[PDB]
Amino acid sequence: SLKHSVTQYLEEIPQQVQNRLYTSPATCLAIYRILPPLAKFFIMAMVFNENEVPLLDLDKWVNSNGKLQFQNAIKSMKSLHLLIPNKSSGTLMINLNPTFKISLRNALTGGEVQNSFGVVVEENVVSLDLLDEYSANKWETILHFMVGTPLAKIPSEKVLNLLKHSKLMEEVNSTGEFKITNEGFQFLLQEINSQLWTLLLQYLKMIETMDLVDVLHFIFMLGALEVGKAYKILSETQRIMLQDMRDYGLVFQKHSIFYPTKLALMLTSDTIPDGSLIVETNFKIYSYSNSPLQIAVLSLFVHLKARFVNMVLGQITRESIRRALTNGITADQIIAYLETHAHPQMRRLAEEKLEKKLELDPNCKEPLQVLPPTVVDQIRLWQLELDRVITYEGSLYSDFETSQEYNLLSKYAQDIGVLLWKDDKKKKFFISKEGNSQVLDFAKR
Amino acid sequence: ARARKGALVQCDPSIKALILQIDAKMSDIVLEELDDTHLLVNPSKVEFVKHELNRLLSKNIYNPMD
Amino acid sequence: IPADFVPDSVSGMFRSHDFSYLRLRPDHASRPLWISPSDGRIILESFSPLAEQAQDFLVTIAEPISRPSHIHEYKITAYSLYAAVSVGLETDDIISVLDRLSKVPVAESIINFIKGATISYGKVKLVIKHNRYFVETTQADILQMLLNDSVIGVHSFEIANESVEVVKKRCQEIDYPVLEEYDFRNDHRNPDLDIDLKPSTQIRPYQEKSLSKMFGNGRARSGIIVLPCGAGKTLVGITAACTIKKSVIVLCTSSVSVMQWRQQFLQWCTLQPENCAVFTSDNKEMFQTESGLVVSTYSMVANTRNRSHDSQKVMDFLTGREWGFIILDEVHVVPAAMFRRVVSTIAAHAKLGLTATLVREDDKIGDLNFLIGPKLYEANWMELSQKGHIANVQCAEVWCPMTAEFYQEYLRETARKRMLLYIMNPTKFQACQFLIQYHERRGDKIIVFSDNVYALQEYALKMGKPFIYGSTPQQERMNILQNFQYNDQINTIFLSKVGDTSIDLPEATCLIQISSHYGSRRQEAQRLGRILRAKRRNDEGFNAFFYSLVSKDTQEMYYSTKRQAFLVDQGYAFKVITHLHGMENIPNLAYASPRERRELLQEVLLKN
Ligand SMILES: [Mg+2]
């Protein structure tokens, strides 16, 4: 939902702010990369003939096999204020956003780009030994800080405030420490560009003027930039957030020139194998992956034993499993990490036996677990034995007159999202304290 | 003529009998019982009996593996 | 640490454990070995070249911790080092071989552990000169070290022959170990028992290797061999007797079993029952040939407190005759009070202890250091399972949900009577009723084990089915087993703590348990050994079933998991049966009525 979250934030951004964002070719190229193939086809079809088209022509062109994705593309196209659907002369005249259209046209033709590709200095240096290594150093420091092992190079103060204020790595100052939330174990489980998107989403969510379109445009040309070259130090707000993301380790800046590392391309797009972990009924770990980061993230929920050059070994203990469950880590998060670290031999054997049993029957009189459950379901039955209860504390009523009134009041509470429990047999339900006043008022009326 | 404040937990017969054990080894905490899936407990000592539930399954399994 | 080795930031939990300071050689690919410098725990890769060749020496010098599918776990121990240097494998050749097969430079802690595992082999020897222990040495050089120790009392001297058992321990701490390697061919004084076998018998290669264990030199090395159930261990012992060829006796603390090894012995061997004899609780008549056999029982030596004079004359006769070799069957019960006295009484020039399981409730299994010696051979359960030499068994655990009334009575029950109270849950009756319906629909032979003889009779009588416990008349017992085996119409049996052993039933294929002792890992494994010898084990589609009805929400969880972990160590994990399909599809459920549950609780209350 990453491009969906970006599109959702863009639709939250109002129409004229969006049209201000559609002014420049680099932002329009980034949004052209965000949009689906169908909407991309629609805008490239429209960009070279300036004719407002009725919707019925589009309906004639579209084969109904891709009609659902067509509706998704045009619904995002309309809700992003990028389409102008008006029913002039009765039929829905369709129009692409004209600022977006002319900026895409100038980008495609190489015309007026205003250095939205980048205000170049072009005094390039080596990126493999300076830029990539500085990026790896700073990103390693913040990654071990997000692990929890002590490390000298802490993050910056504004991103420390990001982790404090945000629900991502809750710096619990009563305990005095940064702490792993469930949201932040989801953050750990995220992809690298997913993590970057989460960081910028939180940063834009709490930053205020620091102009919003400056943030927008500057980030979109930051994604549009290339590697290993010097560039001119742009707006003031864009410059100070440039120095901020310099402190994030993203750019190697020599205090007007700056040298964007591989992470700009990583933001632009992504990139017995590495990370293929042999599961065991013995609950012993033969990882096909070794890093200090790997030991650092695996020590949170595994008793480990020793490190070799690719195989760091250990044992899953139920103490380690319950340690993970008491860390706020979801059992779904743990098992999701296990499918991200599955191994080819057990995968091949599971596929062969999957085809073998589907040749027989889909039911098989057993619960469904495609990966070998002797490592998995032993943990997952203990993970079924993790929460296995539910508690209601606060206001509670009983012994209603009629079942229809019971269902009406309980259903009303479910509609406004304040119902916590119900039981049809006992005609009793529990609601949250926040929802108490609203349910009482509905009961009187 | 009875509508009084209390903490209602959806429960099991087994953990209900465990709550009655809690009453046995220190009495007059838990207030009343409706059925096997509804008991009423002291709202001040809900977390006291929650941590006692924690040490109850600790006594039940204790899972040493050392 | 022969390195600088700046530690990892998370190497603090590697508490003298981060062994990456020692370098990786470029020969890490072909070689499989990683070495623990402190613990000596040894890593073996199954998918590596020459691992099959090196695993023989891995067993010879190290003990195997675990051998799973991918990466085997071993451990160097002084016991296996003593066994390897007793076989004869010198320190520099061993070091050269392990470093030639070692991915990393070898830790000098383990190297000097091997160097300190150097004994005075061949230097102390006890000879039994016609029931007279003459403790010779190969040189007078041993005597000057030996005289420093003063517990005692080329050169031999007087020792109390019972005190030999304790001074073997004493010389293990002062590190001059005696060896027992019989020169039977050079002992012309004992009469030889030249008995052969038939060519139709086939020795499997692991049995051939086991025969090579004590015959590295041809002298009869005395020791321990433990093999899985149904592996023809009787036939291996018969082969060992037929190649020793001297006067020899067989011991085991039972009767039915001892007579059936007598039957099996005189069946496959060429020795006639003229040379054989039997001495137990019933019959006390001996053979009078110069060489031969008295197959017998621990019963006749463990009790001398109250015996007949017929008993007394026979024990006098067998004590007077000096034997060459002895056989100690099911040796896991001998180190107790009246039981290891058989070792003190019997003087034979070679020993061997045998059992199905070398585990018990304590570490009296370490007394075999100074009782019966080192371990000679063992087989692998997964190897014989996948080779079809033993069975391929599905193991299952069945959690019975503990009902409310038996639960609250269980919580107000006293601690050692809580056991029956959790066992008497009617949900167990309902579940085993549906399971016996499903498996007799499958047509399986179903076996139930309970520690309580009364509870076993309760389950059998509720099912209207026969009962087998510790103290029944023998003719009723043979009637029931005759009906079950010979009669096809009788198929399901309820066994107990005398039915787990002392009888030979390879016919068992589906096993259930409901009760045992607190820490009876060994007795649990003796129960499971009944279906280990399921001979339908080579055809595809065979999967033997093991079940265990355990009442939930109990410390029976802890007890059952602690007992069953030995079988997991053997390589037998137990699948999950918590919610099953067909719990309601059976129309009748035994005490599904809540009033029937109350009446059953009333009955167990009235007994309580
Ligand atoms: Mg068997």
DSSP codes, A151-189: -SS---HHHHHHHHHSSSSEEETTTTEEE--HHHHHHHH
Find out whether B6 and A396 touch, Cβ atoms under 8 Å.
Answer: yes
d(CA A266, CA A277): 26
Q: Which residue of C has its CA nearest to A281?
A: C573
Partner-chain residue, chosen from B14, B21, B62, that has the shortest CB–CB distance to C404: B14
**Cβ separation A393–B7 shorter than 8 A:** yes
What contacts C85, CB < 8 A, 6 or more positions away?
C117, C118, C119, C121
In a 13 Å sphere around the CA of A24, the CA atoms on its Cβ side amount to: 21
A224 C-beta neighbours (distance < 10 Å), count: 21
Count of pairs with CB atoms under 8 A, one residue in A, one in B? 34
- Structure resolution in Å? 3.8
Q: State both tokens at A390.
A: 């539910």
CA-based angle A324:A325:A326, to the nearest 5? 90
Find out whether C335 and C314 touch, Cβ atoms under 8 Å.
Answer: no
Suggest the residue from C6, C9, C564 to mutate for an interface test with chain A (most A CBs closer than 10 A).
Answer: C9
d(CA A438, CA A287): 54
Residue with tokens 């002298």: C219
Strand partners, A428: A423
**Chains within contact range of chain A (3+ C-beta pairs < 8 Å):** B, C
What contacts C256, CB < 8 A, 6 or more positions away?
C502, C503
CA-based angle A428:A430:A431, to the nearest 5? 140
B13 inside 8 A of chain C by CB: yes
- State how far residue C8 is from chain A, nearest Cα, in angstroms: 7
Partner-chain residue, chosen from B17, B60, B61, that has the shortest CB–CB distance to C408: B17
Using CB atoms within 10 Å of the CB of residue C392, give its burial: 0 to 12 exposed, 13 to 18 middle, 19+ buried. Answer: middle
> C90-109 burial string, b = 16+ CB within 10 Å, else e?
eeeebbeebbebbbbebbee
C198 is in an annotated binding site: no
C270 is in an annotated binding site: no
Using CB atoms within 10 Å of the CB of residue C482, give its burial: 0 to 12 exposed, 13 to 18 middle, 19+ buried. Answer: exposed
d(CA A309, CA C499): 53
DSSP 3-state of A395: coil
Give long-range contacts, CB 8 A cutoff, 24+ apart: C464-468: C465/C492, C465/C494, C466/C490, C466/C493, C466/C494, C467/C494, C468/C493, C468/C494, C468/C495, C468/C496, C468/C499
DSSP annotation of C187 reads -
- State how far residue C13 is from chain B, nearest Cα, in angstroms: 16
B37 inside 8 A of chain C by CB: no
How many residues make up chain A in this entry? 445
Experimental technique for the deposited model: cryo-EM
DSSP annotation of C352 reads E
d(CA A43, CA A100): 10
Provide, as residue numbers in chain A, all residues whose Cβ is less than 8 Å from the Cβ of C18.
306-307
B29 inside 8 A of chain A by CB: no
Crossing angle, helix A25-34 and helix A212-224, to 10 degrees? Answer: 70
**Cβ separation C557–B60 shorter than 8 A:** yes
DSSP annotation of C64 reads E
Provide, as residue numbers in chain B, all residues whose Cβ is less than 8 Å from the Cβ of A320.
none
Provide, as residue numbers in chain B, all residues whose Cβ is less than 8 Å from the Cβ of C404.
13-14, 16-17, 36
Find out whether A56 and A94 touch, Cβ atoms under 8 Å.
Answer: no
Q: State the amino acid at position C269 in one-letter form.
A: C
C553 inside 8 A of chain B by CB: yes
Q: Which residue of A has its CA nearest to B64?
A: A319
A317 C-beta neighbours (distance < 10 Å), count: 16
- State how far residue A319 is from chain C, nearest Cα, in angstroms: 15
Q: Which residue of B has its CA nearest to A395?
A: B5
Helix (H), strand (E), coil (C) string for C450-519: CCCHHHHHHHHHHCCCCCCCCCCCHHHHHHHHHHHHCCCCCCCEEECCCCCCCCCCCCCCEEEECCCCCC
Q: State both tokens at A51.
A: 């004719």
C567 is in an annotated binding site: no
d(CA C550, CA C529): 20
Note the Cα C436 to chain centre separation in Å. 31
**Cβ separation A149–C9 shorter than 8 A:** yes
> With DSSP H G I counted as helix, E B as strand and the rest as coil, what are the percentages for chain B, rounded to 5?
40, 20, 40
d(CA A164, CA A172): 8
C596 C-beta neighbours (distance < 10 Å), count: 14
d(CA A295, CA A147): 10
Interface of C with A in 26-65 (CB under 8 A): 34
C589 is in an annotated binding site: no
Note the Cα C550 to chain centre separation in Å. 25
How many residues make up chain C in this entry? 608
Q: What does the radius of gyration of chain B's CA atoms come to, in whole angstroms?
A: 13
Find out whether A395 and A433 touch, Cβ atoms under 8 Å.
Answer: yes
